[PDB]
Amino acid sequence: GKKCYKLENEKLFEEFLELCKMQTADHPEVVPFLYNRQQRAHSLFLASAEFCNILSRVLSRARSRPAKLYVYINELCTVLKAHSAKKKLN
């Protein structure tokens, strides 16, 4: 069927988290929060070209305009939340 992007999306998501680690050291809670949303997402989304498109876009935009990083983080948070499979624990 459609092309599977599971492994590519893991690579791209890690690149975005690394970018966040460089720029959000004063709010260390941001990176684990985004990781938690990734871990709670539906498998279909995690393997999708849809997620590849979003990650490609926010990576490019964040590298071009680092002064808008949190705009792009919020966009990623929102779409991950829309694809959540389970509630947050503890």
Binding site: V30, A67, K68, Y70, N74, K88
Partner: peptide, 30 residues
Amino acid sequence: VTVDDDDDDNDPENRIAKKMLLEEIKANLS
């Protein structure tokens, strides 16, 4: 003009997005 501790404030859209995200995270919701 006063400066603060961070370097996220130059763009007003970014400052709003940051405030919103950090408040969301602090709330510890799903």
